[PDB]
Amino acid sequence: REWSLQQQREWKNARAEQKCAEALYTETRLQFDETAKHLQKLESTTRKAVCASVK
Amino acid sequence: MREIVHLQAGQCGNQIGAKFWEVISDEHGIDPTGTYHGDSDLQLERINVYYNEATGGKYVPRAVLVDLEPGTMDSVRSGPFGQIFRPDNFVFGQSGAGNNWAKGHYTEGAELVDSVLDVVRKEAESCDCLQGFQLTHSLGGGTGSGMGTLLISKIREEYPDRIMNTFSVVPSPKVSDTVVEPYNATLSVHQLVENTDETYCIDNEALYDICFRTLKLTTPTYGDLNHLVSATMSGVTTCLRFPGQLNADLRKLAVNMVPFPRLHFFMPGFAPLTSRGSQQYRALTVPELTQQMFDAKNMMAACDPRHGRYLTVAAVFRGRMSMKEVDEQMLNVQNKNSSYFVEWIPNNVKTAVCDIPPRGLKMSATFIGNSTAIQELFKRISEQFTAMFRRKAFLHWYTGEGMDEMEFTEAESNMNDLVSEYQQYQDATAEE
Amino acid sequence: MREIVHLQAGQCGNQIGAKFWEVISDEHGIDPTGTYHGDSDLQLERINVYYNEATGGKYVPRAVLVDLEPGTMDSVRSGPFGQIFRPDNFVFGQSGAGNNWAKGHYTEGAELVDSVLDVVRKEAESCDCLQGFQLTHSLGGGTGSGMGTLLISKIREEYPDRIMNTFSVVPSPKVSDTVVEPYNATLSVHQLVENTDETYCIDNEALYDICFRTLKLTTPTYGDLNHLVSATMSGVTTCLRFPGQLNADLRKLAVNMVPFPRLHFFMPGFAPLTSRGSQQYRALTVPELTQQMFDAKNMMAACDPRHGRYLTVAAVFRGRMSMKEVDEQMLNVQNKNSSYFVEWIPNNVKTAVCDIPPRGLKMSATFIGNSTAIQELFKRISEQFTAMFRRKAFLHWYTGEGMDEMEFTEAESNMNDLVSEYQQYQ
Amino acid sequence: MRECISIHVGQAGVQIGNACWELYCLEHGIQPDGQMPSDDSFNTFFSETGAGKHVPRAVFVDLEPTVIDEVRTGTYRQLFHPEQLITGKEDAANNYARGHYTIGKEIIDLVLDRIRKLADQCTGLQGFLVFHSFGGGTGSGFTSLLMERLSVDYGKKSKLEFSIYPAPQVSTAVVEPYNSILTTHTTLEHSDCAFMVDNEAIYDICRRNLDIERPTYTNLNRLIGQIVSSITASLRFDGALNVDLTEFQTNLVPYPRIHFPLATYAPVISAEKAYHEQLSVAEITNACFEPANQMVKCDPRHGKYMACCLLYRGDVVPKDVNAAIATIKTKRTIQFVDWCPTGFKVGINYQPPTVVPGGDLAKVQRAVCMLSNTTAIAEAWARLDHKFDLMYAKRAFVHWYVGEGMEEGEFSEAREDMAALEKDYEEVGVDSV
Amino acid sequence: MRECISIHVGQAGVQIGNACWELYCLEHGIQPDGQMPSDKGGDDSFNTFFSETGAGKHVPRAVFVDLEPTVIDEVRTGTYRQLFHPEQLITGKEDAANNYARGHYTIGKEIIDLVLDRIRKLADQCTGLQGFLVFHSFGGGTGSGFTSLLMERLSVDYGKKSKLEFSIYPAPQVSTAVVEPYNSILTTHTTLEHSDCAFMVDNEAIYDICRRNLDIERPTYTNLNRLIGQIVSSITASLRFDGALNVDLTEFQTNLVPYPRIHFPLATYAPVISAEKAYHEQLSVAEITNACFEPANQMVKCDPRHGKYMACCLLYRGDVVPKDVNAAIATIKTKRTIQFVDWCPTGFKVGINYQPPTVVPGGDLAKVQRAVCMLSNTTAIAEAWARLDHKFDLMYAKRAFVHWYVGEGMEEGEFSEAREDMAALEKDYEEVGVDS
Amino acid sequence: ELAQAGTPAPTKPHDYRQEQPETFWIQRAPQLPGVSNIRTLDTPFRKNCSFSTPVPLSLGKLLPYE
Amino acid sequence: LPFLPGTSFKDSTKTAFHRSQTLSYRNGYAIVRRPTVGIGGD
Ligand SMILES: Nc1nc2c(ncn2[C@@H]2O[C@H](COP(=O)(O)OP(=O)(O)OP(=O)(O)O)[C@@H](O)[C@H]2O)c(=O)[nH]1
Ligand SMILES: Nc1nc2c(ncn2[C@@H]2O[C@H](COP(=O)(O)OP(=O)(O)OP(=O)(O)O)[C@@H](O)[C@H]2O)c(=O)[nH]1
Ligand SMILES: Nc1nc2c(ncn2[C@@H]2O[C@H](COP(=O)(O)OP(=O)(O)O)[C@@H](O)[C@H]2O)c(=O)[nH]1
Ligand SMILES: Nc1nc2c(ncn2[C@@H]2O[C@H](COP(=O)(O)OP(=O)(O)O)[C@@H](O)[C@H]2O)c(=O)[nH]1
Numbered sequence A: 001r002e003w004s005l006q007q008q009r010e011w012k013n014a015r016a017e018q019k020c021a022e023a024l025y026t027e028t029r030l031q032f033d034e035t036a037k038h039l040q041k042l043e044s045t046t047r048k049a050v051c052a053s054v055k
Numbered sequence B: 001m002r003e004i005v006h007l008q009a010g011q012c013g014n015q016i017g018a019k020f021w022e023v024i025s026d027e028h029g030i031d032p033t034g035t036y037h038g039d040s041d042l043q044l045e046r047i048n049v050y051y052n053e054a055t056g057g058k059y060v061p062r063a064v065l066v067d068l069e070p071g072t073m074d075s076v077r078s079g080p081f082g083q084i085f086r087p088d089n090f091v092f093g094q095s096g097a098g099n100n101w102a103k104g105h106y107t108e109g110a111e112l113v114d115s116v117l118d119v120v121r122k123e124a125e126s127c128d129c130l131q132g133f134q135l136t137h138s139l140g141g142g143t144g145s146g147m148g149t150l151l152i153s154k155i156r157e158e159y160p161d162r163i164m165n166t167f168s169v170v171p172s173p174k175v176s177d178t179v180v181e182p183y184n185a186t187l188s189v190h191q192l193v194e195n196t197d198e199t200y201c202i203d204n205e206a207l208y209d210i211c212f213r214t215l216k217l218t219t220p221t222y223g224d225l226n227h228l229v230s231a232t233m234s235g236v237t238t239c240l241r242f243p244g245q246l247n248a249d250l251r252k253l254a255v256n257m258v259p260f261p262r263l264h265f266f267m268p269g270f271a272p273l274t275s276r277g278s279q280q281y282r283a284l285t286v287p288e289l290t291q292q293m294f295d296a297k298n299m300m301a302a303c304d305p306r307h308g309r310y311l312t313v314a315a316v317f318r319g320r321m322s323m324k325e326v327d328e329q330m331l332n333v334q335n336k337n338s339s340y341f342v343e344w345i346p347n348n349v350k351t352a353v354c355d356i357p358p359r360g361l362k363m364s365a366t367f368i369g370n371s372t373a374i375q376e377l378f379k380r381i382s383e384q385f386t387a388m389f390r391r392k393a394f395l396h397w398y399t400g401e402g403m404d405e406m407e408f409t410e411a412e413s414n415m416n417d418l419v420s421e422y423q424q425y426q427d428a429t430a431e432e
Numbered sequence C: 001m002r003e004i005v006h007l008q009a010g011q012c013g014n015q016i017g018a019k020f021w022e023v024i025s026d027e028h029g030i031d032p033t034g035t036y037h038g039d040s041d042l043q044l045e046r047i048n049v050y051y052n053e054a055t056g057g058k059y060v061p062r063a064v065l066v067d068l069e070p071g072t073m074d075s076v077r078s079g080p081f082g083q084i085f086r087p088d089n090f091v092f093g094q095s096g097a098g099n100n101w102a103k104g105h106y107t108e109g110a111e112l113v114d115s116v117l118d119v120v121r122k123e124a125e126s127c128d129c130l131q132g133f134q135l136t137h138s139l140g141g142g143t144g145s146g147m148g149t150l151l152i153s154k155i156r157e158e159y160p161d162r163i164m165n166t167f168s169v170v171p172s173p174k175v176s177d178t179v180v181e182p183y184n185a186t187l188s189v190h191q192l193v194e195n196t197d198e199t200y201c202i203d204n205e206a207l208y209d210i211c212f213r214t215l216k217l218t219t220p221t222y223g224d225l226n227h228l229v230s231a232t233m234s235g236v237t238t239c240l241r242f243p244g245q246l247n248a249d250l251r252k253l254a255v256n257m258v259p260f261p262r263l264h265f266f267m268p269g270f271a272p273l274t275s276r277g278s279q280q281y282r283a284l285t286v287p288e289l290t291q292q293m294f295d296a297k298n299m300m301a302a303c304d305p306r307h308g309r310y311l312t313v314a315a316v317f318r319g320r321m322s323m324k325e326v327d328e329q330m331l332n333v334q335n336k337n338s339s340y341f342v343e344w345i346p347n348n349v350k351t352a353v354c355d356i357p358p359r360g361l362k363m364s365a366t367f368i369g370n371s372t373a374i375q376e377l378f379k380r381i382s383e384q385f386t387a388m389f390r391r392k393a394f395l396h397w398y399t400g401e402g403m404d405e406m407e408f409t410e411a412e413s414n415m416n417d418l419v420s421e422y423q424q425y426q
Numbered sequence D: 001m002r003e004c005i006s007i008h009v010g011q012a013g014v015q016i017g018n019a020c021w022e023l024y025c026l027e028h029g030i031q032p033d034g035q036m037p038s039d040d041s042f043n044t045f046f047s048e049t050g051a052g053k054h055v056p057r058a059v060f061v062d063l064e065p066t067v068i069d070e071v072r073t074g075t076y077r078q079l080f081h082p083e084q085l086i087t088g089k090e091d092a093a094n095n096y097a098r099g100h101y102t103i104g105k106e107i108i109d110l111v112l113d114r115i116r117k118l119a120d121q122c123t124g125l126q127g128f129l130v131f132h133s134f135g136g137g138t139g140s141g142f143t144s145l146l147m148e149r150l151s152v153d154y155g156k157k158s159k160l161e162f163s164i165y166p167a168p169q170v171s172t173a174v175v176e177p178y179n180s181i182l183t184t185h186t187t188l189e190h191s192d193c194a195f196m197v198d199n200e201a202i203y204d205i206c207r208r209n210l211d212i213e214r215p216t217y218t219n220l221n222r223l224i225g226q227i228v229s230s231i232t233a234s235l236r237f238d239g240a241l242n243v244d245l246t247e248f249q250t251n252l253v254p255y256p257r258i259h260f261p262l263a264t265y266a267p268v269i270s271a272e273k274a275y276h277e278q279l280s281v282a283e284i285t286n287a288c289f290e291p292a293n294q295m296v297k298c299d300p301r302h303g304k305y306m307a308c309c310l311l312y313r314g315d316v317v318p319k320d321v322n323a324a325i326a327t328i329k330t331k332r333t334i335q336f337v338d339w340c341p342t343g344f345k346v347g348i349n350y351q352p353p354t355v356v357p358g359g360d361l362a363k364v365q366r367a368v369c370m371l372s373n374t375t376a377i378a379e380a381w382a383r384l385d386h387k388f389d390l391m392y393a394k395r396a397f398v399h400w401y402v403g404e405g406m407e408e409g410e411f412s413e414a415r416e417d418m419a420a421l422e423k424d425y426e427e428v429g430v431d432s433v
Numbered sequence E: 001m002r003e004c005i006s007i008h009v010g011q012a013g014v015q016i017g018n019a020c021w022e023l024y025c026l027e028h029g030i031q032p033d034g035q036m037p038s039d040k041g042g043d044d045s046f047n048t049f050f051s052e053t054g055a056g057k058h059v060p061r062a063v064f065v066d067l068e069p070t071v072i073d074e075v076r077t078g079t080y081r082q083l084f085h086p087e088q089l090i091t092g093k094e095d096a097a098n099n100y101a102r103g104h105y106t107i108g109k110e111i112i113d114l115v116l117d118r119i120r121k122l123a124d125q126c127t128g129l130q131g132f133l134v135f136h137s138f139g140g141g142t143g144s145g146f147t148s149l150l151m152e153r154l155s156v157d158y159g160k161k162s163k164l165e166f167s168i169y170p171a172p173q174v175s176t177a178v179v180e181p182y183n184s185i186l187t188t189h190t191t192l193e194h195s196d197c198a199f200m201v202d203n204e205a206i207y208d209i210c211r212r213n214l215d216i217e218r219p220t221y222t223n224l225n226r227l228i229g230q231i232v233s234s235i236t237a238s239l240r241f242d243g244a245l246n247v248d249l250t251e252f253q254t255n256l257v258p259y260p261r262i263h264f265p266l267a268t269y270a271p272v273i274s275a276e277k278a279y280h281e282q283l284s285v286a287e288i289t290n291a292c293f294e295p296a297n298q299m300v301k302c303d304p305r306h307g308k309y310m311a312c313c314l315l316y317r318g319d320v321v322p323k324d325v326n327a328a329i330a331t332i333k334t335k336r337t338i339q340f341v342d343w344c345p346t347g348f349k350v351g352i353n354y355q356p357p358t359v360v361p362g363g364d365l366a367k368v369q370r371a372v373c374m375l376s377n378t379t380a381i382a383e384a385w386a387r388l389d390h391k392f393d394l395m396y397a398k399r400a401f402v403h404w405y406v407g408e409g410m411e412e413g414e415f416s417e418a419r420e421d422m423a424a425l426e427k428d429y430e431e432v433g434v435d436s
Numbered sequence F: 001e002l003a004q005a006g007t008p009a010p011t012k013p014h015d016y017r018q019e020q021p022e023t024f025w026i027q028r029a030p031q032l033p034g035v036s037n038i039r040t041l042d043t044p045f046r047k048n049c050s051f052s053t054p055v056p057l058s059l060g061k062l063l064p065y066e
Numbered sequence G: 001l002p003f004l005p006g007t008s009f010k011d012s013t014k015t016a017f018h019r020s021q022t023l024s025y026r027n028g029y030a031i032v033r034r035p036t037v038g039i040g041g042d
């Protein structure tokens, strides 16, 4: 009984640590996606400004 | 472990399914962003039926939106719950069909099926044990009826031993929102009778009558009609995703309602629909659910079962309730109106019970009826089709785009054969 | 210990070659100066494969840049990563080939091979145990196709028992960026079939397809196309410089791909490429990689594998993953599709697994597929070579440089026989 | 040493298994965690573990995960072994052919493997008890080849059969007669004894007796569990006159084709109505003979009592048992066959029945369960033959069986076989020449 | 005094060696540095595997041979860099690359002298040699080719020494190469003539075991090699630890191998259970001895219900008693499913060891009281060989991949000769299995 | 409903990877046939070959009962 | 931002694209000059 309890407690701790690492990866991915969207918006605005200057 | 792949054909299909996904997203607790914000551990027990997993706890629907006019696609994508669908699942053509079944089936709708079957295969082998396919469309248009039937006839040859459900908005008897709607409806039903496993007929007359007389609404917009249709669509597949005392899947309902392979046209109904005035003046009981289900007013088709005979009946209940009173009430309603049931089948009614009711509600129920009162619809459509076909109305449009003249005659022959089969199964006797 | 020498020919070879060295200088943490600025100590375990050690902890690439005009070599040197190349490795003439195969093979390119083989012999003998060579060129030009096949037949006589790879950009069906394109494309494929171990067919039409419907780029300049090619060149050799559970080098893939020595034309692909809008609508699993890897929209050559039979197939995975799920997916695609795979070879697909994914990404895969449907590429050129040749168009630019006219009829019969080797295995 | 193996098939089997095993756990004083808070009376049902735990000797089988997953995430998630709960992927969906041919063959291997492991652990096995329903697809189809394989694998082991029959009036399906006719070859040839119950009768009992205005399947399955516990309590607990699984088969089955008894229980009364009632042995054995307390919708006054087995629990005296039997035997209302002068078997057990929290029955001192074999079953079979032939006249629903593997001659041969079974009962019950 | 020499050839050999030697160090209490903290002599159980230096260090008796550096350098850089000898990790420069010819004729002749020199040094250190244990894989180039001439040289150098062979066979359905049947036919001479006892395993069966037993949805090569290490430890524990009735290597070779041409047992281990299912099961002797006979628990994709059992060797470890052993064997002998041949009436050999198996932290198995390992010599291996002869004939019908093998140095006769050798070895099994 | 007692308390400290399970053999270790000299505090079932080794090829070791 | 096939961006407000000559010939020798200037004079 004691051995099985200790083994499954340690397995649970390992799975929790893996879940936390995956959460950190998803947060960094979300930050990169937001930066990419902002950069695309900036590039489109600069292109429209250049065309208006030419006209 | 039983996935349902959703198919949307036409502008009508896009509107109905765009309401349907909102309703079951609210049912399973899904925000407009896509994540899960709910207060139960039971809502994620069976969520893989309609949703595919994503990263970061997101769920995306297993649905495809097929159309030839991207205006409805833009309307769906700009909606409130429009940011949940994957951007690749919108399959939009470049030229419309223009209410032409020939344009839908042969000329412009024959080049879109390659991309549509590609996306359908990608969403079909992604499932573990796929249960079947579902379609939502209307037989009065050009894209839903013209090319949706082509999609059915392709995917059923691809996947023979699966199940195919259809929600068809068959033409209204008095509205006639299109001049050539009997042409489209006849040429679509002639394919549906061979290539469809279950068909559900939905009528705007019935929806208007319910939303006017029952719910007592001043302005019945299409949002309320799509809400009613989506409530029926959600109530059909409830036992797959919510546990109950007596489960029932789409295959089981097909088994217990389809005695012969050409008799698979159903009329639906929903049970507790009450107005704001009469909400407090009514107690929620199983007799008050069965009465409202079996009332001929509450049918979602413009066909009256007092002219016909109930071949089979299915009922799906939702809520914590008593098996004794459920079986007692449905035996009682079977016994009382003894002339509205056939005599060569005992126990015409299948019953199912699911535990979990919809939100804000205590008890509910859904009725699916196979009767012979559906041949009235086919007789009316056939008489209008043969009303135009002797004077050869509108026929150059269909003939100049690749159709022979024998197609219309064989559609007439198949439709007349189906209505004569329905008549003989109504008039059949016990002694033989 | 297992070194790879990079050869760049043409302006197409130089623009692909300059983007390639920008990619793996970021994998190994090499700044534009040339030094090392990285976080892991495993990045310097196998860096002698591509770089030469210099004084002060500076690494220079083992690449030689060959062109008959410095017009493109000036644009490479003025870029961000234009300071890493050794200034003695730039080999250049003063007269262009003019998109002529005869000038680039016999007249103008014959002088320039005196200087290239002094540089190639200097870099090849400095290694410990040379794995093989590598080439980047185009078959529709004068420098890439003319002299780039003169270098192949000269370094294979010197080094016969090695690995010769080519990343050749074949002509496209409807693009046609050269009027005399099939003369240079037919006379170069005739030289590749006898003198090359592995050949990767890349088409600029297929790279336009990926940047439109997969990446959803509004303005896909050639900086992005040369990224797609360079993400495949670093994925093939990623088991040479990174540890893994099951690793495969350049030689191990060529053994398991080529059943007969004439059949060595492949079709590359890369897997986790996703548009920016659909970044959050997708889950990362091994079945997500294997689905996109075998996609017919994802091949880098303008040949559809649905019209032919997969002879052999490879996949080189990257990232930490389970060996059951890798071996389960390659079996699953073979059992369902029993018509796109040959019947006298069971288990067509080979698998390799690396442990270090590209930076900022969790998993990757590179696809190498030998297919019968590559005969579509050689049959649409042989119908355009024969269309021009029977009216004898443009021969005075070729026959006027001494080239015999029977060499044109030999290039037909070697390439018309090649499409008949492929037909009998379909 | 003496032990039984429970095999529950279908959704009905799994629900009855839940309601039976809760009663067994409370009867033997085992927590839902599986540990006894602290005599080998549990050894008939529970098996010891190397962690000090008790694991049931039961196999739950189903073709869908929706009903087994409630057991897996319920209160008794720790008690059951995780490999005793066998699940398919797609259910048979009210089809005999799906459950027998196409879908049963993927899990028959796993079910036979677990059955082999349990019977290898059994040092001496009394038999298998099979809990199933005729109407459902899995219970109709998979159970047929389950018993067919068990008959080949095991020679003379006992196979008791608790089955759900369709009700004469109410039903939960349409193809219920089709699924119920085709099992009358397996339950005829490859079954040893088969008790049949139907839910409308138990609805009547719970409505009239226990004062419950709205019974549920829990309120039915608890009564079924009480019956099964009263049957097996002679094995489990010491008593004055023990009876055995082989023993009542010997004393109740006169011919190999006649193994369809009727199971009744008494007293079934509420806690308020038990407060004013003096329940003597005669007062509990008179209620078993009443047709209003039968558990099948059939009347034994049309038939002849062929054999009777009584099982008493509690503060019961053999003198008063004999006096009650003597008072029963003098009634002209109850008729016995001429070829059985002494028709009774008597078992007496000391331990009273156990009350459950939240249940509907009352705490009682004595109780009785009766297994009576009579000739009032031909009416119940013919009342279903009317429905089956009325459906089969027009070949309704029959493509849904033909296209999935089975030929159409199986319908006719099963109808003819069970028709001969119906005919045999009349010459069994006719008066001697 | 009793000693065994481990020879790990190829990437599979190196990885199985890592997973084995971690287990050996942890079982004998040796730190990754190489020193035992528990020195408070009197202990000799490590002398089978570890040689003791006077400085207090214990060096393994293993040789890691490889033709590529990418996996030997992981060993040289990782946790056990200070444990292994610097010269016991032999590495080449260019690998064979799935080529029997490259591994046998061209590349292997450069390093075979170094390998034989280190083998000579280890066997000279050994005062009495039980034998060699060769860990290799059939599919790969080095394991297919270099091991062949390594064993050809070892048979000449060492006459009567036992050479046990832990081989990875190609899986019948899944695989990781395409010239794998071509390499797996050509080693059927060097595993037939130059081996004493050959245990074949394949990855698909161990994938199935780790799927349905340990509840690992995504197993890896570490999870497979841990089970293989458990098997080798259960074989060698009779030499290493005190037991009631000990079994030696020559002893179970005698009791397992009936003819010189027939030396192909099947290895099974029980119980392979997880810590969540160790709570709901008692692992008695009569129940761990029935899991070895189940065809689902076999480590080769073959069904022994089709064949005839010829001999069995059972090795029990832990809380196990002869009364329960005899009762369980009596229970097994009465089943009509398990069939023995007529000329082997007493078909069992039994060994018992006192010390229960150890556990690795972070591992997959559970801490168990007792365990059993079975080596069964049967007839149901001819199906596993025919399932790959089919693939070899299918490829060789039209001479695919033949120029690769021909150009490096062999001739084309070895393909047909090796296929004929496999055909004769397949006919011999049915000739033996036919009763009288 | 009602109250359920938890897991029983351990009377002695337990830690896996270090603790040897009880056997009949480890309860009666000095009294068995087949057990060698007991000089290891970890397990009594580790082989001691001090007596069996020859007088040559023997390091400094302690003979049994001496 | 990670270095990826789709993550590249370029400056739009650039107007001078003059290509300087770092490789040329003096006497008979191919010379290579240090690139003291970029594209456009920057
Ligand atoms: N007495 C009793 N009968 C039940 C109970 N639950 C279900 N049933 C019976 O089960 C029959 C329907 O079959 P189910 O048990 O629901 O499902 P199944 O037997 O597994 O068959 P499939 O649904 O096709 O898989 C009905 O006729 C009910 O009479 C129960 O709790 N008590
Ligand atoms: N069980 C198991 N098998 C392995 C492992 N690693 C590799 N293999 C097997 O090895 C085979 C491939 O050959 P390898 O051993 O990897 O390579 P090799 O023997 O050195 O031959 P070359 O690569 O040509 O040098 C595959 O079929 C795998 O099944 C492992 O860790 N465990
Ligand atoms: N019930 C319902 N019917 C609709 C809806 N939208 C359109 N329709 C019906 O669909 C018919 C026209 O369909 P149409 O748009 O031409 O279909 P399409 O050509 O395939 O796009 C009309 O008869 C409408 O009554 C809706 O939201 N709900
Ligand atoms: N993929 C890719 N193709 C290119 C690039 N630059 C040119 N090409 C292609 O190369 C072909 C002509 O090459 P060319 O300039 O004649 O090569 P050269 O004669 O050796 O200098 C054209 O069809 C272009 O499409 C590039 O940067 N990337």
Ligand SMILES: [Mg+2]
Pocket: D010, D011, D062, D063, D064, D091, D092, D136, D138
């Ligand atoms: Mg079921």
Ligand SMILES: [Mg+2]
Pocket: E010, E011, E068, E095, E140, E141, E142
């Ligand atoms: Mg190797």
